[PDB]
């Protein structure tokens, strides 16, 4: 008489591709408290869907055709199109909510909207800003996935999104995930430059991008002392897919993909869960709060002010 409610096999659609709410996740929610919400953000081919799938209910040794979050297929890469649309939803058995996100400012959505405001160009930017603000106001942590280092345009977008957010202020933690890392990026000399650039580029961001999720203490660098870094921000690197002398494998210079994925998952799960509103909330209450926030963000006033400026 204490069996679990149900087990989710595949992620559902929390928000339709037309920016419409979809109330269909209450069937898998309970009345428990102390819930954790994780969101993702990134460009078109960064790999947010794969990261979310591997961090929620998947393993690297499994296949990409059975992932909880649909990933880009080989036939789709040749056409230069996107796969994830709208916002997804999935909750693991540990009562951890995972939220996916479509690419921001991606040319695929723009091209699809061409054959369908003053011009059909600021619409994509506003949709991206709306999603960023929503994830920044109803999620406990947000992970930013970057295909390459220093895009120089994501920081400005993040600051602008946080400046136009809906609303003793609450600022969720920010995580910088560098996907498809190489050996050259796994050196202390380059690490210092990376941390310095990240810290100097977000000096007045008001977000919690430091003091938590320190990969230096996760045994990634055995002999690297903590004082070697002026300010270790929350940055993590994810590498590319992976008689006796002649059988020695090649030298990669970076830890195994599975090891880093497991470490990242453990660190994400062992994170804090601060309060969102000025009251305690449960799973159902959190769902209702998120729905109300999305409804308010859609018919907001700051967005119109920013729209007349473009």
């Amino acid at each position: 008489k204490l069996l679990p409610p149900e087990r989710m096999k595949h992620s559902i659609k929390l928000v339709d591709d037309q920016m419409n709410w979809c109330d269909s996740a209450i069937e898998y929610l309970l009345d428990q408290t102390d819930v954790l919400v994780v969101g993702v953000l990134g460009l078109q081919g960064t790999g947010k869907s794969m990261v979310m799938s591997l961090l929620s209910a998947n393993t690297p040794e499994e296949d990409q055709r059975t992932y909880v979050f649909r990933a880009q297929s080989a036939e789709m890469k040749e056409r230069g199109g996107n796969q994830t649309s709208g916002i997804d939803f999935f909750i693991t058995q540990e009562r951890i909510v995972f939220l996916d996100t479509q690419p921001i400012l991606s040319p695929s959505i723009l091209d699809h909207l061409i054959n369908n405001y003053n011009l059909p160009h600021t619409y994509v930017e506003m949709q991206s800003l709306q999603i960023a603000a929503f994830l920044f106001t109803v999620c406990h942590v947000v992970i930013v996935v970057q295909d390459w280092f220093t895009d120089l345009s994501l920081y400005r977008f993040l600051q602008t999104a946080e400046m136009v957010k809906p609303s003793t202020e609450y600022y969720p933690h920010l995580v910088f995930l560098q996907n498809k890392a190489r050996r050259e990026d796994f050196c202390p000399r380059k690490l210092r430059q990376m941390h310095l650039m990240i810290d100097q580029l977000m000096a007045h961001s008001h977000l919690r991008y430091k003091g938590t999720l320190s990969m230096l203490q996760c045994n990634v660098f055995p002999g690297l002392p903590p004082d070697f870094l002026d300010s270790e921000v929350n940055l993590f690197l994810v590498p590319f897919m992976d008689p006796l002398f002649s059988l020695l494998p090649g030298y990669r210079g970076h830890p195994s993909f599975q090891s880093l994925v497991s470490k990242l998952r453990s660190q994400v799960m062992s994170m804090a869960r601060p309060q969102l509103s000025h009251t305690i909330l449960t799973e159902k209450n959190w769902f209702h709060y998120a729905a109300r926030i999305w409804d308010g963000v859609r018919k907001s006033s700051a967005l119109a002010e920013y729209s007349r400026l473009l």
Binding site: L2, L3, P4, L30, Q32, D34, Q93, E94, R95, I96, C187, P188, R189, T212, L213, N219, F221, P222, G223, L224, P243, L244, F245, L247, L248, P249, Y251, R252, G253, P255, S256, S259, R265, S266, Q267, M269, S270, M271, A272, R273, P274
Partner: protein, 820 residues
């Protein structure tokens, strides 16, 4: 570095700085600090050095050109040990070093001429590095280290083997599968003289320290109700409803805003203990308002389950749902695991309640004011409930083979009874102490109870020390004096035996203890006589309550197998429960099996006997070997259950019966596939246990002798060359005889001496008066222990006279003269 390979990889250049010295001693600064910021240089140097050394067979033959390279292997070993012992190595560097170490090790034992290379210190440093490099987060590295250690298992000192035993014990319970099998094989490759030693285990100590540190910390209050519900469902019902879930749960229960080692997070024992403690903390901190029900609902549920288990303990023919029936061999082990977890949960709950209403000092943090004020007013109810269920808890603990739980509960119950349940408590506590081999505690309890009719406790105290003959004689005397009728049976002289060393429940207990005593010494005739005497006593006294709880069919089967009558043994075995005799593999154990370890041991013994008789009948090569190998493999896999369970708790020791059963199963599996052609088919019980296993009774050697005589008799049906088992059998028999004589078991000692040599004092005198000197000394010692000191002294003098004119006469003449 890459260009230097032209001269480094030469096929035979006399320069001043040698390439080997340049890459091994000149460039020694790359491993100090450059290995952290520039690991590529270190990897390249190690790679070129390995490539240059592998082309010359690591310079083994040498250990002009030969004289110049007379100290290369030592340097290589020292470098490998120093590098492996470090803790700031990279994944690639560690993998390369492990590959090099494995290649060097496998290389070491191939020759029979490299034996002196095992005494130099560099080898010890290399072994130390290999042992310290295991137990890491990486799985492949651990597997490589285990394989390397298993390669050159022999030629290592007692210290290295002792450390390997602890490493294997801690690794036996891992979330993976390959690690468990690899370490299990490595452990099975270690002799019994070291696995059964009483040395301290460092890994177990670290695990206990980590658990203590976590418990002493302040409560986290992060355990969600769903986690508790899942744990309770998996313990009480067996269904966890979760698809390595322990690690995920532990990680989800932590917080970064607000410290068990990571290497220990892959062990299921630590995770289970942490989950149990967290569940108990959540139950206590929630005012007993768990999702299971109200404050009284949880108590009623636990009481009902405990009462059901206690009732089933009295009569095995109960068939308790969700506790005695399983679907395959995997559920049987889970049943015992769940029972152990339940007992641990109850103990933790009691500790938390006591700390809540009373408090501790420097051990547990004081709970909030609300918890203390609530537990202070409702302390009487908790004490009453605990006292009411203590009787059933003792029985449940005894059934699960956990004498510590029942002993602690019995002590608490006795203390609480400061004002006819007094005899049963003493009986249960005495039995539990006897199972732990603690005669001092038994004697103390006997003396303490004498100040309140209870003189039979001394018999159990004597039995706990290993004196089966005296214990059985005392049991018969007590039963005869308490019942009123002569219940004595044929046995050895009472005077010689002594010189060498009124309720139905009490009568039944004494009878069962006597039967178990006779079964332990492997005296089938005595068991039959005891059964006849018991039946006659019951028929002449109308007791209607005495009944021996021992399957006589199994005893008859054992007697037939030991006597050599396989024809009757097969017929007797056809009636025992379980799978039919070999002519499907996962479900070998029968259903409705109680979680009592004794039942599991009996089933394992039955399976071994079935395999032995099947092999004997089939022999008189893949005709009847494809199935026997699978049967033995499954038996060995199931026999490792008790060893794995022992690691779940801080026991610092391993069961002897389970370990011996597993070793016997492995020996049978090796002999069925090798037809007695390798030294791995023998039991590792050697004479070395004389100076390191003096804390064990004679039962351990009974199984070894039983399974060794079978192979000895089977040797007559093999025409090809075999291994010499006569020497092994003689040594094993002599050691067992010495162990039996040291405890006063003259009846068993006489049988062993007669068997090795191929009921009255004069009988021994008229029957006794490489292993020659040892056998003669043992015979003299037995004669002296029997009372005939003059005869023993005369025989020893004659033996010394004959030994003084022998060839060696090193450890024989001196020993005989000293004893005389």
């Amino acid at each position: 570095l890459s260009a230097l390979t032209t001269i480094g990889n030469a096929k035979n250049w006399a320069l001043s700085p040698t390439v080997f010295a340049l890459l091994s001693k000149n460039l020694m600064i790359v491993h100090s600090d450059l290995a952290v910021h520039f690991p590529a240089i270190q990897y390249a140097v190690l790679y070129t050095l390995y490539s240059h050394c592998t082309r010359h067979d690591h310079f083994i033959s040498s250990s002009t050109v030969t004289t110049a390279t007379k100290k290369h292997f030592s340097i290589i070993l020292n470098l490998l040990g120093i590098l492996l012992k470090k803790d700031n190595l990279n994944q690639d560097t560690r993998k390369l070093l492990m590959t090099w170490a494995l290649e060097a090790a496998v290389l070491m034992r191939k020759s029979e001429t490299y034996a002196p290379l095992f005494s130099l210190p560099s080898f010890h440093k290399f072994c130390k590095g290999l042992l310290a490099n295991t137990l890491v987060e990486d799985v492949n590295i651990c597997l490589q280290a285990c394989s390397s250690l298993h390669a050159l298992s022999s030629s290592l000192p007692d210290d290295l083997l002792q450390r390997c035993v602890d490493v294997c014990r801690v690794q036996l319970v891992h979330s993976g599968t390959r690690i468990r099998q690899a370490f299990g094989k490595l452990l099975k490759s270690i002799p019994l003289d070291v696995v059964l030693s009483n040395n301290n285990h460092t890994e177990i100590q670290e695990i206990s320290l980590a658990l203590r540190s976590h418990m002493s910390k302040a409560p986290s209050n992060t355990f969600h109700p769903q986690d508790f519900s899942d744990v309770i469902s998996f313990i009480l019902y067996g269904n966890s409803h979760r698809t390595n879930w322990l690690e995920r749960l532990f990680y989800s229960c932590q917080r970064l805003d607000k410290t068990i080692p990571r290497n220990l997070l892959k062990t299921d024992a630590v995770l289970w203990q942490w989950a149990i403690w967290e569940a108990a903390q959540f139950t206590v901190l929630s005012k007993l308002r768990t999702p299971l029900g109200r404050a009284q609902d949880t108590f009623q549920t636990i009481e009902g389950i405990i009462r059901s288990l206690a009732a089933h303990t009295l009569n095995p023919d109960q068939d308790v749902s969700q506790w005695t029936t399983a679907d395959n061999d995997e559920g049987h082990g889970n049943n015992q695991l769940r029972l152990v977890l339940l007992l641990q949960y109850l103990e933790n709950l009691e500790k938390l309640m006591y700390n809540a209403y009373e408090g501790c000092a420097n051990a547990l943090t004081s709970p909030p004011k609300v918890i203390r004020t609530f537990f202070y007013t409702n302390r009487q109810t908790c004490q009453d409930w605990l006292t009411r269920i203590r009787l059933s808890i003792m029985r449940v603990g005894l059934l699960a083979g956990q004498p510590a739980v029942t002993v602690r509960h019995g002590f608490d119950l006795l203390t609480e009874m400061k004002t006819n349940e007094l005899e049963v408590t003493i009986m249960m506590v005495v039995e539990a102490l006897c199972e732990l081999h603690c005669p001092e505690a038994i004697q103390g309890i006997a003396v303490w109870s004498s100040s309140i009719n209870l003189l039979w406790i001394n018999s159990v105290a004597q039995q706990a020390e290993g004196r089966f003959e005296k214990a059985s004689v005392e049991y018969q005397e007590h039963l005869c004096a308490m019942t009123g009728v002569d219940c004595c049976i044929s046995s050895f002289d009472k005077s010689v035996l002594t010189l060498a060393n009124s309720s139905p429940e009490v009568i039944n207990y004494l009878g069962n203890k006597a039967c178990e005593c006779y079964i332990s010494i492997a005296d089938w005739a005595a068991v039959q006589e005891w059964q006849n005497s018991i039946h006659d006593l019951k028929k002449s006294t109308s007791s209607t309550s005495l009944n021996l709880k021992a399957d006589f069919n199994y005893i008859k089967s054992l007697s037939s197998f030991e006597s050599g009558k396989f024809v009757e043994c097969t017929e007797q075995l056809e009636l025992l429960p379980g799978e039919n005799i070999n002519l499907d593999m996962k479900k070998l154990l029968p259903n409705m099996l109680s979680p009592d370890p004794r039942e599991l041991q009996k089933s394992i013994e039955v399976q071994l006997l079935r395999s032995s008789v099947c092999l004997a009948t089939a022999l008189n090569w893949q005709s009847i070997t494809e199935n026997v190998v699978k049967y033995l493999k499954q038996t060995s896999r199931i026999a490792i259950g008790p060893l794995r369970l022992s690691t779940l708790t801080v026991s610092q020791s391993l069961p002897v019966l389970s370990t011996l059963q597993l070793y016997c199963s492995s020996a049978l599996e090796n002999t069925v596939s090798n037809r007695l052609s390798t030294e791995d088919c023998l039991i590792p019980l050697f004479s070395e246990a004389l100076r390191s296993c003096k804390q064990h009774d004679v039962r351990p050697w009974m199984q070894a002798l039983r399974y060794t005589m079978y192979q000895n008799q089977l040797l007559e049906k093999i025409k090809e060359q075999t291994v010499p088992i006569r020497s092994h059998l003689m040594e094993l028999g002599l050691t067992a005889a010495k162990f039996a004589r040291k405890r006063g078991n003259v009846s068993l000692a006489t049988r062993l001496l007669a068997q090795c040599s191929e009921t009255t004092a004069q009988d021994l005198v008229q029957h006794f008066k490489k292993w020659g000197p040892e056998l003669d000394i043992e015979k003299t010692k037995l004669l002296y222990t029997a009372g005939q000191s003059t005869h023993a002294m005369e025989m020893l003098s004659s033996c010394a006279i004959s030994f003084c004119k022998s060839v060696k006469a090193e450890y024989a003449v001196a020993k005989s003269i000293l004893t005389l």
